[PDB]
Amino acid sequence: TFQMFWLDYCEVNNTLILFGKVKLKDDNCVSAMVQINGLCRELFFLPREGKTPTDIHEEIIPLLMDKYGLDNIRAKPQKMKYSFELPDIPSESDYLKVLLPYQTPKSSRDTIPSDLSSDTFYHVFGGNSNIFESFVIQNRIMGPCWLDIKGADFNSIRNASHCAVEVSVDKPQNITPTTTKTMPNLRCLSLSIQTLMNPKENKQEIVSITLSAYRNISLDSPIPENIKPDDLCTLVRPPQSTSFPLGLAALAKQKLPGRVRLFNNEKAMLSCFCAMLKVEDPDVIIGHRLQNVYLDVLAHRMHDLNIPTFSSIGRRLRRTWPEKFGRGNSNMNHFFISDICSGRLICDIANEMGQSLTPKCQSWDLSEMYQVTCEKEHKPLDIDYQNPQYQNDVNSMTMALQENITNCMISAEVSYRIQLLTLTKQLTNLAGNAWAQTLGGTRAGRNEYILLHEFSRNGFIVPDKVFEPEKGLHKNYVLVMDFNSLYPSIIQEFNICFTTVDRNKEDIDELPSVPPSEVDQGVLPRLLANLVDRRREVKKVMKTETDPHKRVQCDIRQQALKLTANSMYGCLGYVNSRFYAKPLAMLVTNKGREILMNTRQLAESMNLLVVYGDTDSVMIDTGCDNYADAIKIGLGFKRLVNERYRLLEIDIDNVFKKLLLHAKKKYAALTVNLDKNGNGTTVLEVKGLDMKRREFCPLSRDVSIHVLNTILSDKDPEEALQEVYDYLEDIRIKVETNNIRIDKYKINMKLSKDPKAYPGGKNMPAVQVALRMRKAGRVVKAGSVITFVITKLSVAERAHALNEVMIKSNNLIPDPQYYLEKQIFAPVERLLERIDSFNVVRLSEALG
DNA sequence: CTGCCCGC
RNA sequence: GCGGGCAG
C-alpha cells in the first residue's frame, strides 16, 4: 500500500498525474507523483422507446472496438435519472454504461458526439468528459486529502517529475480516499521579485529574487504570528553593468539577513533560481501579485533567456516549452504558466481570492495589506533600478535588496495571518474540485463540482460541458446590510431544484411555478440545508469554545460554509454555467424581488430610508449620528427581516459614519473599524470614482482623496467647502508654476488591441504615444500599458511617454490647462455635484 | 464571467 | 457596433 496526501494534478498524454506528499518510515514527508492509467470516460447510452441496454451493447460495442482498436470494452446496464435542460430525455431510464478508456491505440483524440442517433439509443452522456473530472467523480475524491494507493509501480516511471518519488498505477480503482482529517506539513516558499523596465523592448527584466523558506507549515494547527523562516536567500544581478562593485558581498553579509548570492547576468541568476527551487521542492509558492504580474514575468524571462531547467517552477519535468508559448496571446500564455506550475500551489495574497479575505483593504498594495492585517507599519521604498545610483552605490543597492527581503517576509506573514491556505482548502473539500482552482479565483469552478458530486452520488446523469440610489451626501450613519444569502434561502424555502421544478425545456423563457408542498425535498435544496445546519453546529460550538486556536479555526470553517452556500445560485443563474437553467434563475429572481420589496417596506416601516439596494446588499440610513444608536437600529432591522423570512439571515456588513453616494457602485464613505478594545476608528473607502481609474493621475487621486476627507469631515459644511476651495487655489498655483513632481502627472492606459489597429486612435493620446515609440525604436505590442504625460497643437499630439518626459533636459513640462481642467476640475465637479452650497463658479474661478 | 457606466 | 473601464 502507498499513502499520499494529494495537493494538485495535471493532464498529459491522456493520463492523469497527481502531485502530493508521502510519509516515509521516519515519518518524513517528501514530494511524489502518481501517474494514473486505465482511466475511462463513463458514457451513458439512452435507449429508444422499446429498447434495452443489451440492444445498444450489441450494436455500438463492436463498432467501438474497431474505431478505437480495443480487444474488449467493459460495459453494463445501469439505471440512471436525468432532470436537466435537455428536452425529450426522460426522468429515469435504463442506460448502457460504456467504460471507454482515454488511452486508445487508435483515434484517442476523437470524441463521440452527444447526438449519436441509432435505432437502439438516441443520446449519449459523458462523451467529452475531462480526465481529472472523471477520476475525481468516479472515485468520490473531495479535494485535497489522504489517498490509499495500492499496486504502485516504483520501477515504471523514471525522470518524469521534480519529485522525490515517482510511481504509476495500472488502474484508477487502485486509489481510494481515506477519512483522515489531518494533513501533512507543507513546504512553503515566499517569493519576492524586483524587476527593471527596458524601454527598448518594453520588457520587464528581473534584477533580484528573494526566497524565504518555511518548511513546516501545519494547517492542522494555527500558524504562530511573525513565524521565523528556516532559510532566507537573495539572488541578484547587476541592473546596469556586467559586474557589481567590490565589497558588496562583504557589506551584504554585514547588513542583510540570510544568504546573498551575486551573479554576472540575469541568465545565471535564473538558472541558479531553478536549481534552488528544485532542491527546496516547496508544496506552496507564496507571493504578492504572482498570478498576473510577477509569475508571468518570471516565466517569460526563463523563456527569453532559454533557461533549460525552467520546469522546476512546477513539479512536472519538461524539456521544451509549449509550442504556442509566446505567441503574443496574453490570454493563452496564462494557461501555459499555470499548467507548468502544476504540482506546486500558488498562494497569491493579492489575487481575486486573496482580496476577498481582506475587504478592509482598498489598494491591496503589499504595505497596505501588511498594515491592515497585522497592524504593523512599513514604508514602501520605490526602487527604480534604471536610476544610475544603483550601478556604483553599494549602499543604494543594499537598501533596495533589503526592501525586497522585507517584502518577501511580509507576503508570507500576511498569507498566514489571513489564513488563505486553510480557507481555500476547506472550500475545495466542500466543492470537491482542485485546490489549485480555488487558490486561483474562478466562478464556474467550485460551483460546478459541488453539483457534479452531489448529483453523481445520487445516481443522476450530469450535463456535458434594485433600488435607484439616493445621490448625495449622507450625514447620518449608513449601514450596509448583506443579502448574499438571499438566493440560497429562497432555493431552500421554496424547494427549488432541477428535480422539483416542472419547467418547459423547449421554451427556457417560460416562467415555471414553484413546486407544491407535496413534492419531496429536492437535491439542490437538501444540499443547501446540510450546509446551513453544519454552519449552525459550528457557531454553537463557538459560543462555548474557549481555546483561541480552536475558536479561530471554527470561524474559518463557518466562513467556508457560508461562501459555498452563497455561490450555489451562480450554478443555475449565470448563463455560461454547466448547470444553467433560465426558468430556475427567473423563478428565484422574482421571489427575490418580492422579498426585497417587502424589505423596502420594512425599512420604511422603521422610518429608515433605503439609500441604495440590490440583490447582494441594501444600504440603509439609520438617521443616527452615533455608532451605538446606529448599531441598535441595524440589529432591529436584521431581526425584523428574519421574522418575515425565517430562513433569510441578513447581517451588518459595513458601517459608514458618512456616505457620499454618486451612483450604483460609485461612492466615497467613512467606514468604522472597531479594534480589539472596542475602540472605534474611521477610514476612507472609495468605489467606482474617477479617483480609481487608470486614466486619472496620482495628482488627481491626491486631490480627490483630500477633498473627500474634508467633505466627509464632521466640521461645519461651509467651512468644509471653503477649505476645499482654499485647497484647490493652492494646488492651482503649484501646477501653473510646475512645482509638483512629474511622476504625479502620469496617466496609464491599456491597449487591448495593436496600437495600429484603432479607428479613432488619432485622437487617443495613449495610441499616439505608442506609435511614436515604434518609430523611435521602442517595442510596443497589444496588451501593453502606456504611461504618458500631456505636455505644453493638439492634446493627443502633446502627449509623450512618461520616461521621455522624466528627462529634465527635454524641456517637456506638463500642460497646466489640461491637468487643472480635465484632471482636477471635472473630477471635483462630479464629486461635489450634489452637495449643498456647492458652486461650480467658485471652483472654476479657483482654477480658471 | 456578467452587467454597467464612460467615450467616438 | 467598436473601444475604454469600473464593480461583485
Numbering used by the authors: 351 to 815, 848 to 1174, 1187 to 1242
The authors write:
The eukaryotic primase is a heterodimer of catalytic and regulatory subunits that is associated with the catalytic subunit of Pol α and its accessory B subunit in a constitutive heterotetrameric assembly, the Pol α/primase complex. In contrast, the Pol α/primase complex produces longer, composite RNA-DNA primers that result from the concerted enzymatic activities of primase and Pol α. The catalytic region of Pol α adopts the universal ‘right-hand' DNA polymerase fold consisting of a palm domain harboring the active site, a fingers domain that interacts with the incoming nucleotide and a thumb domain that grips the primer-template duplex.
Rotation of the palm domain is accompanied by a conformational rearrangement of region II that is necessary in order to accommodate the phosphoribose moiety of the incoming nucleotide. Interestingly, site-specific mutations of Ser863 in region II of human Pol α (Ser867 of yeast Pol α), which acts as the pivot during rotation of the palm domain, cause a drastic reduction in the specific activity of the polymerase without changing its kinetic parameters, in agreement with a potential structural role of this serine residue in DNA polymerisation.
